[PDB]
RNA sequence: UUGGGCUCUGUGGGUGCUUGGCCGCUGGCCAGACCUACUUCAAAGCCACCGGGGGUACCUACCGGUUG
């Protein structure tokens, strides 16, 4: 994957192999790498407990 | 008795003859035959039915020549035949399917005259017959012509175990040619290897592989058998 | 005298290359005699330019009247066959971490061996270059390369993670949960998955948004492959049916009545002419997949075949139980009525290692078998196409040609709405 | 790193190339040229340079006409080594080894290095036959061509014999025969590998006095160092070490002493036997074996030093009179007492003459 | 280090069985 | 594949194996003269039991996806399932003298069925977790 | 008659030159998606024009 | 003669000569009476299915059976090189030398 | 006690109670052998893990339909 040219980039605007929009700006392993979380599954476990706890605040 | 086991438990017996009084030393299965060699007679059972076939009696000249101390052995491509080594120098060729003494071969160097150990070769139609006076003789047995002659045994300590390697390499001072012999002796615990190509030089000896049979010591050293695990180093 | 044979090469030329019936026949009339003469010489110069091809194909022939091809040992092949590919008959002993899924690239230059207890490794197998060996802990369902040998994707216990050439996790795919089978659409950029709960997920691996999720209704899936010709996608369903799919059609697009038990294994030709599957009812049967017509009275396998994989030429590799057999002439493309192969060809033997996935090299004459004790690699002379085309797929690609081929492929990413049965449908009424 | 070890062993086993970095780095190796000049060089060009050199060597000797027929033929520009079955790679390694035995004398000459540079730059003898190529350049281990060999030599396709050259490959300097002889003492794998070479070139009558003097030198100082190792003074250890020494050296000397048509290596084996009876306290039956074989392998050209070896062997033998064949061929010596007086001006001859004349009493 | 022994695995061998000699 | 269950005869001359693949198999101890050892065909998931009667003609076989088949001589005389909402059949025991089949499930419930013909005696739930044995 | 098919990288670079030799097979079993890749090439042609 | 020397000059220079490069690279005591009376059919047993010449051959004597089974013992194990004097050589091949 | 010492490396056994190597296994093979048959009857349903708030044009799902 060379640095794409002018016409190839504007024919490929949404393209990137590395970041996807589903990857959530790689926030997952910014936090994993920063706080030494030895498993990404434990990231997402903590994430869903954050989500349920915060929607409990919402419905309060 | 001759019991027959499988998986650790007995699955058969074997009918010995009534006329038998001798301890029985060589069990040997080939062809469709189970052949046992006692001390001066050979009892041969048919193996497909475990049923007693005949009993082979060797000739006798001086009441010691009938003794059968080299055992008996089979060649690979020799059909219903068995090769016995006597207390004379003789090795006899017996068609065990029909009982007949078909051929007999005479020792080289008639001062050395009791066959202590014999083994087939990885070559066809050649034997390492092994005499009590020292020589290993290794022979054609349908040309009855010697291929090599070696002086392996001491007169005080002859070869009692002899075993070729069927790996296909091992000899030639780097190790790329076959022809590696192994021999041992009931008097020492040292096994001796022979390159076999040009004239069959020695190449080394494991000294005290097992303990030596020590006079005035209580340990029970010595050797009983050498076998190259066939096809393997 | 010889003009008859000229018309014969004209017949074979417009069979292989003419790609259509022919245009039958005022300004339109002369423009289509123009176009038809240019098409005639285009097919005839392609047929004449077939003589410039470098490599010949491998074979082995029964020179006697009693020596037969399934008896030939690979000591005999490795001795009687050239030393560069006698290098390529290698084995690789890995006992401790599960049965080893294997998969090549599409130039054959790299393989992943995934190990179900966790052990996933990406390598250049010819030069012995271990590009990655990641340990990964928990269980591993499937691994596969993406468009190059530069990114790979592995289906984990819960998600599907994708990784760079150094084995560094670029991202976790969360939207695909308990994916059990994967297939990559290469002319698209379209990572397609079956989960364990029967849900196709068609992603684009270039743009990164999932493009067509469709829950198949047939319960849990038990098989999956991919037609290289159509980009349509064969999932194998445990009522006995090979259910044939697409990102567009939310119904099954065509489902075939294959077997009686769960259909254990699937494969299709790269030319997309035929199909071979096998199930619990131990028959292994083939179809003329264009006409959707079972062309051959079914074969049997001595065990339920956990794998099948068919080659760039006609050889099929069925991996059953603990040893795998190859089969030569199962579907002759040039013959109208398909006859049965009376006897196999090159059985790799059973010595106590259950083969978990068989594969072929795409342009080598080797086969990569994926057993519980690791990866074994055997040589079998007939397989692999001799002549490649380095415009499309290059087994010897430098970094310049990797980067150029990647960006040309991204400029020719087909759209997911372009997938159908007959793929030359574009431009009809 | 189990898979790393198995793939590493596949990669070091790999005799071919599959990326363009290794076609260029593989075609780059050369004796004559530089890397930058050797990369961009086709095989018709190298065949022109070399085959000029092989025309020169075909003028200089005469046994190179069959290698014009095979190895330096006009058709051997297009023989890739790695697309050849193992019968073809075996036969081609036979012709390569016989050619290299034949060349190994004239190897300080640029026509010989041109012919060897065609064998390297096409047939990759530096990648397929490194034992014979190190065995042929190893006598000339002081000339700089041996160091160009040590810069094209692949570090992990070298026999374990020859792996002492690793710091000399690493720092490009020619090794001394102190190092060659020292690892020849410790490794019998090395000392046999030299003597497997030199005897192989003499069954085909392709010897030269640098090979003869080089081999006899290494056997000389090497067997000196081996006897100094094998001494222990513990009786069963020195017995077992004497047997091990005879089993190592034994067959090499047993052909070399009898090789009458090469009087050089005949004299070198006389030399090592004289060292062996002199410093090594070998038994009387062993020394009668050396004397009887010395007596059998006998030439007009090796009369005069062989008599000196009879004086050494008989002098260190502990028993009194000789045995048979020794007395018979020493009868066949023409100028006996005069030659033994000329020897006795510098050696001790009296136990040899005593064993002779006592055996003549017993005839 | 070079020349250390490999681990012993059992080498296969198509050996000759003798029950066809009869 | 794996073999989940083993059930003998009453006279201890035949026994029969409930798979983990899909099938059951009927097997001897010594060679009978009109018997070839044979395979009881397709369920959906894989059999958790395969039990004899008293009269050794009809053979019962109980899969994991709820279905229980009756085979005669070797085809199948009547396959019959039963409904269950979110659970799969994980154990089954058959008393051949009193002709009754219990079946414990993944959701803590067991069903109890008199079976010469499919006929529910009873069912109730004992756990919130699966029934193992 | 056991012949495999053998390739070295000599058919990629003849050694002694730098021509990346590019062989090509024009049998349509290796180049799928004629109408569709030429559609996407044509769409990029209009977008670039 | 069909191939002149000029034509072979042009065949060497133009076409290639790997065929000629390859061609230049590649340069009793006793008798048993039983084996007339030990006839064996070869296609009975599975291990003897594979030492007959053609498919339609069974009736094989003990002599011919001995020859085929010799050829297969050579096939599993070819004949060794050792099976086809000097005082120090005799000293090395004598085991009276190597004592304690 | 006619050498010793550190360090590093390799191989084999051990670190859980001893029932064989392989297969298409009630039998056969470990030198293998034979290779491609046989067929009356597609499928029973349910369930099936994406973090929180929010948008809904297009696609998809589901619900109610509408003509043709």
Coordinates of C-alpha atoms in Angstrom, one line a residue, chain D residues 98-350:
Chain D
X98 CA 37.1 -35.1 -10.1
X99 CA 37.7 -31.8 -11.8
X100 CA 38.6 -30.2 -8.5
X101 CA 41.0 -32.9 -7.6
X102 CA 42.5 -32.4 -11.0
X103 CA 42.8 -28.6 -10.7
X104 CA 44.1 -28.4 -7.1
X105 CA 47.8 -28.3 -8.0
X106 CA 47.8 -25.3 -10.4
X107 CA 45.5 -23.3 -8.1
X108 CA 47.8 -20.3 -7.7
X109 CA 47.3 -19.6 -11.4
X110 CA 44.6 -17.3 -12.8
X111 CA 43.5 -19.7 -15.5
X112 CA 42.7 -22.2 -12.7
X113 CA 40.9 -19.5 -10.6
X114 CA 38.9 -18.6 -13.8
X115 CA 37.8 -22.2 -14.3
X116 CA 36.9 -22.5 -10.6
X117 CA 35.1 -19.2 -10.8
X118 CA 32.8 -20.7 -13.5
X119 CA 32.1 -23.6 -11.2
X120 CA 31.2 -21.2 -8.4
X121 CA 29.3 -18.7 -10.5
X122 CA 27.1 -21.3 -12.3
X123 CA 27.2 -24.7 -10.6
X124 CA 27.5 -23.1 -7.1
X125 CA 30.1 -25.6 -5.8
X126 CA 30.5 -23.1 -3.0
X127 CA 26.8 -24.0 -2.2
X128 CA 26.7 -27.7 -3.1
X129 CA 30.2 -29.1 -2.6
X130 CA 31.9 -27.2 0.2
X131 CA 33.8 -30.1 1.7
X132 CA 35.7 -30.8 -1.5
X133 CA 36.2 -27.1 -2.2
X134 CA 37.5 -26.3 1.2
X135 CA 39.5 -29.5 0.9
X136 CA 41.1 -28.2 -2.3
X137 CA 41.7 -24.6 -1.3
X138 CA 42.8 -25.7 2.2
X139 CA 46.4 -26.6 1.2
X140 CA 46.7 -23.0 -0.2
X141 CA 45.4 -21.5 3.1
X142 CA 47.9 -18.6 2.9
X143 CA 47.3 -17.1 -0.5
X144 CA 44.6 -14.4 -0.8
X145 CA 42.3 -16.5 -3.0
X146 CA 41.6 -18.6 0.0
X147 CA 40.3 -15.5 1.7
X148 CA 38.1 -14.6 -1.3
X149 CA 36.8 -18.2 -0.8
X150 CA 36.2 -17.3 2.8
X151 CA 34.2 -14.3 1.7
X152 CA 31.9 -16.2 -0.7
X153 CA 31.6 -19.2 1.6
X154 CA 28.1 -19.7 3.2
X155 CA 28.7 -19.9 6.9
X156 CA 26.1 -22.6 7.7
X157 CA 26.7 -24.9 4.8
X158 CA 30.2 -26.0 5.9
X159 CA 31.0 -29.4 7.5
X160 CA 31.5 -29.6 11.2
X161 CA 35.0 -30.6 10.4
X162 CA 35.8 -27.3 8.7
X163 CA 33.8 -25.1 11.1
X164 CA 37.0 -23.9 12.8
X165 CA 37.2 -21.3 10.0
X166 CA 34.3 -19.3 11.5
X167 CA 36.3 -16.4 13.0
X168 CA 38.4 -16.4 9.9
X169 CA 35.3 -16.0 7.7
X170 CA 34.1 -13.4 10.2
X171 CA 37.4 -11.3 10.1
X172 CA 38.8 -11.7 6.6
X173 CA 42.3 -13.0 7.3
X174 CA 43.8 -16.3 6.3
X175 CA 44.1 -18.8 9.1
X176 CA 47.4 -20.3 10.3
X177 CA 48.2 -24.0 10.3
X178 CA 48.6 -23.6 14.1
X179 CA 44.8 -23.4 14.1
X180 CA 44.4 -26.0 11.4
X181 CA 46.6 -28.4 13.2
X182 CA 45.1 -27.7 16.6
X183 CA 41.6 -28.5 15.5
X184 CA 43.1 -31.5 13.6
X185 CA 44.3 -32.7 17.0
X186 CA 41.0 -32.2 18.8
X187 CA 38.7 -33.3 16.0
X188 CA 39.5 -36.6 14.4
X189 CA 36.7 -35.6 12.1
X190 CA 39.0 -33.0 10.6
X191 CA 42.2 -35.1 10.4
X192 CA 40.3 -37.9 8.6
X193 CA 38.7 -35.4 6.2
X194 CA 42.1 -34.2 5.0
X195 CA 43.4 -37.7 4.6
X196 CA 40.1 -38.8 2.9
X197 CA 40.9 -36.1 0.4
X198 CA 44.6 -36.7 -0.2
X199 CA 44.3 -40.5 -0.7
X200 CA 41.3 -39.9 -3.0
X201 CA 43.5 -37.8 -5.4
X202 CA 46.2 -40.4 -5.4
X203 CA 44.1 -43.4 -6.5
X204 CA 43.6 -41.4 -9.7
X205 CA 47.3 -40.2 -9.8
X206 CA 46.6 -36.5 -9.3
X207 CA 48.9 -35.6 -6.4
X208 CA 51.3 -32.7 -6.0
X209 CA 54.0 -32.0 -3.5
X210 CA 52.2 -29.2 -1.7
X211 CA 49.4 -31.6 -1.1
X212 CA 51.8 -34.3 0.0
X213 CA 53.9 -32.0 2.2
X214 CA 50.8 -30.3 3.6
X215 CA 49.1 -33.6 4.6
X216 CA 52.3 -35.0 6.0
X217 CA 52.8 -31.8 8.0
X218 CA 49.3 -32.0 9.6
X219 CA 49.6 -35.7 10.4
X220 CA 53.0 -35.0 11.9
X221 CA 52.1 -32.2 14.3
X222 CA 48.6 -33.5 14.8
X223 CA 49.6 -37.0 15.8
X224 CA 52.2 -35.4 18.1
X225 CA 49.5 -33.5 19.8
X226 CA 47.2 -36.5 19.9
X227 CA 49.9 -38.6 21.6
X228 CA 50.4 -35.8 24.1
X229 CA 46.6 -35.9 24.7
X230 CA 46.2 -39.7 24.8
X231 CA 49.0 -40.1 27.5
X232 CA 47.6 -40.5 30.9
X233 CA 49.8 -43.0 32.7
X234 CA 46.7 -44.8 34.0
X235 CA 47.3 -48.2 32.5
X236 CA 43.9 -49.0 31.1
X237 CA 43.4 -45.5 29.9
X238 CA 46.6 -45.5 27.9
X239 CA 45.9 -48.9 26.6
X240 CA 42.4 -47.8 25.5
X241 CA 43.9 -44.6 24.0
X242 CA 46.5 -46.5 22.1
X243 CA 43.7 -48.7 20.6
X244 CA 41.7 -45.5 19.8
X245 CA 44.7 -43.9 18.2
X246 CA 45.3 -47.0 16.0
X247 CA 41.6 -47.1 15.1
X248 CA 41.7 -43.4 14.0
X249 CA 44.9 -43.3 12.1
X250 CA 45.1 -47.0 11.0
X251 CA 43.5 -47.3 7.6
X252 CA 45.0 -44.1 6.2
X253 CA 48.5 -45.3 6.9
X254 CA 47.5 -48.8 5.9
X255 CA 46.9 -47.6 2.3
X256 CA 49.5 -44.9 2.3
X257 CA 52.4 -47.1 3.2
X258 CA 51.5 -49.6 0.3
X259 CA 50.8 -46.9 -2.3
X260 CA 53.9 -47.5 -4.3
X261 CA 53.0 -45.3 -7.3
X262 CA 52.9 -42.2 -5.1
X263 CA 56.4 -42.3 -3.5
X264 CA 55.6 -38.9 -1.9
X265 CA 52.7 -40.0 0.3
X266 CA 54.6 -43.3 0.8
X267 CA 57.5 -41.2 2.3
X268 CA 55.0 -39.1 4.4
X269 CA 53.5 -42.2 5.9
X270 CA 57.0 -43.4 6.6
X271 CA 57.4 -40.1 8.4
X272 CA 54.3 -40.4 10.5
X273 CA 55.1 -44.0 11.4
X274 CA 58.6 -42.9 12.5
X275 CA 57.0 -40.2 14.7
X276 CA 54.6 -42.8 16.0
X277 CA 57.3 -45.3 17.0
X278 CA 59.5 -42.5 18.3
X279 CA 57.3 -40.6 20.7
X280 CA 54.4 -43.1 21.1
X281 CA 55.4 -46.2 23.2
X282 CA 53.5 -48.7 21.1
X283 CA 53.7 -52.4 21.7
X284 CA 56.1 -54.8 19.9
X285 CA 53.4 -56.6 17.9
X286 CA 52.2 -53.2 16.6
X287 CA 55.7 -52.2 15.7
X288 CA 56.2 -55.5 13.9
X289 CA 53.0 -54.7 11.9
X290 CA 54.5 -51.3 10.9
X291 CA 57.8 -53.0 10.0
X292 CA 56.2 -55.7 7.9
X293 CA 54.0 -53.2 6.0
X294 CA 56.9 -50.8 5.5
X295 CA 58.8 -53.8 4.1
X296 CA 56.0 -54.7 1.8
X297 CA 55.4 -51.2 0.5
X298 CA 58.9 -50.9 -0.9
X299 CA 60.3 -49.0 -3.8
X300 CA 63.7 -48.1 -5.4
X301 CA 62.7 -44.4 -4.9
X302 CA 61.8 -45.0 -1.2
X303 CA 64.6 -47.3 -0.2
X304 CA 66.8 -44.7 1.6
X305 CA 64.2 -43.2 4.0
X306 CA 62.5 -46.5 4.6
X307 CA 65.7 -47.9 6.0
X308 CA 65.7 -45.0 8.5
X309 CA 62.2 -46.0 9.5
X310 CA 63.4 -49.5 10.0
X311 CA 66.1 -48.2 12.3
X312 CA 63.5 -46.1 14.3
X313 CA 60.9 -48.9 14.5
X314 CA 63.5 -51.6 15.4
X315 CA 65.2 -49.3 17.8
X316 CA 62.0 -48.6 19.9
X317 CA 60.8 -52.2 19.6
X318 CA 61.3 -53.9 23.0
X319 CA 61.9 -57.4 21.6
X320 CA 65.2 -58.5 20.3
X321 CA 65.0 -60.2 16.9
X322 CA 62.9 -59.3 13.8
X323 CA 60.3 -61.4 12.0
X324 CA 60.6 -63.0 8.7
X325 CA 59.5 -60.8 5.8
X326 CA 61.6 -57.9 7.2
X327 CA 64.7 -60.0 7.0
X328 CA 63.8 -61.2 3.5
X329 CA 63.4 -57.8 1.9
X330 CA 66.4 -56.4 3.8
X331 CA 68.2 -59.3 2.1
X332 CA 66.8 -57.8 -1.1
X333 CA 68.3 -54.4 -0.2
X334 CA 71.4 -53.9 -2.5
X335 CA 74.0 -52.0 -0.4
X336 CA 73.1 -53.1 3.1
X337 CA 76.0 -52.4 5.5
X338 CA 77.2 -49.3 3.7
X339 CA 73.7 -47.8 3.7
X340 CA 73.4 -48.7 7.4
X341 CA 76.7 -47.0 8.2
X342 CA 75.6 -43.9 6.4
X343 CA 72.4 -44.0 8.5
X344 CA 74.5 -44.7 11.7
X345 CA 76.4 -41.5 11.2
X346 CA 73.2 -39.7 12.3
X347 CA 70.9 -42.3 13.9
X348 CA 71.1 -45.5 15.9
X349 CA 71.2 -48.7 13.8
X350 CA 72.4 -51.3 16.2

